[PDB]
Each structure stands twice: as C-alpha cells, then as structure tokens.
Amino acid sequence: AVKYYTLEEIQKHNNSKSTWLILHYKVYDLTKFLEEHPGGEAVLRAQAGGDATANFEAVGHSTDARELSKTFIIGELHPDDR
Ligand code: HEM
C-alpha cells in the first residue's frame, strides 16, 4: 500500500524541523523545504501538524506549486482520520 499517516502521527511533526501537514487529505513533508519555501520558515512550521488545507488554499498557490506539492507528496491521510 501507500503508507498513510494519521492526524496524530502527522501532529507529532511540529517542533522546529519536522514539519508535516495535510492539504486536502494528502500529506506533504516540507521539513527540508522550510528555509527553501518563499513564505518564510514560520507560517509553514506553525501550521505544521495538519489542518493547513484552508491555509494553503487561502494563499491560493500556482500550478507550479500544485505540481511541486505532488513531488513532495509522502502519502495520503489515514483512512481512519476522515
Ligand atoms: C504543498 C506544499 C507547498 C508547496 C510546494 C508550496 C510552494 C509555494 C510557492 C512556490 C510559493 C510562491 C507563491 C506563488 O507565486 O504561487 C509559495 C508561497 C506561499 N506559501 Fe506555499 N507551498 C506549500 C505549502 C504551503 C502551506 C501548507 C502553507 C501554509 C502554512 C503555505 C503558505 C504560503 C505563503 C504564506 C506564501 C507566501 C504568500 C505571501 O504571504 O506573500 N504554503 N508556496
């Protein structure tokens, strides 16, 4: 299978580096994208844990981003979260 991650497991990644989150039932590791991500390592690290779909969408982001995200996809939201 793909190995989905629970909101909890994703929630464990919210300290300094470990920065995961859920964007439309999809998990994106951006731990090695903090300093890289133009928004500035802050909003990403803060919204880390999950429930950033609205935040991500609120920014809008472009096609390039939408595609990049897929390259950063680590899996999907656990089938026991939804
Ligand atoms: C799925 C992974 C993500 C990728 C690949 C990504 C990529 C990008 C890129 C390329 C930009 C440039 C803006 C543009 O012209 O489109 C950007 C800006 C931005 N992103 Fe992301 N992003 C991701 C996730 C997030 C998340 C989860 C948040 C919310 C916590 C976020 C918040 C922002 C903000 C605040 C900006 C700057 C807008 C501003 O305040 O001026 N991004 N992102």
Side-chain angles (χ1 to χ4, degrees):
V2 290
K3 182 166 180 73
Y4 315 99
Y5 310 95
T6 59
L7 229 179
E8 196 66 52
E9 247 59 65
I10 303 160
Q11 258 268 40
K12 293 200 154 172
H13 295 220
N14 58 2
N15 233 264
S16 170
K17 284 91 193 78
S18 218
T19 284
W20 288 12
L21 41 90
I22 299 156
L23 271 24
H24 309 273
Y25 313 130
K26 288 180 167 306
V27 197
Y28 293 92
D29 173 31
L30 317 165
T31 298
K32 273 164 176 187
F33 209 48
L34 295 170
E35 211 170 24
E36 306 236 56
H37 176 282
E41 48 137 317
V43 67
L44 307 322
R45 89 180 193 71
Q47 277 296 122
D51 198 359
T53 312
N55 230 105
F56 180 67
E57 290 265 283
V59 178
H61 291 86
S62 194
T63 325
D64 206 317
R66 289 151 127 268
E67 269 269 31
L68 181 19
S69 312
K70 283 246 168 146
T71 256
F72 273 129
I73 221 186
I74 45 165
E76 257 174 331
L77 175 76
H78 202 249
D80 219 50
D81 164 294
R82 66 265 300 284

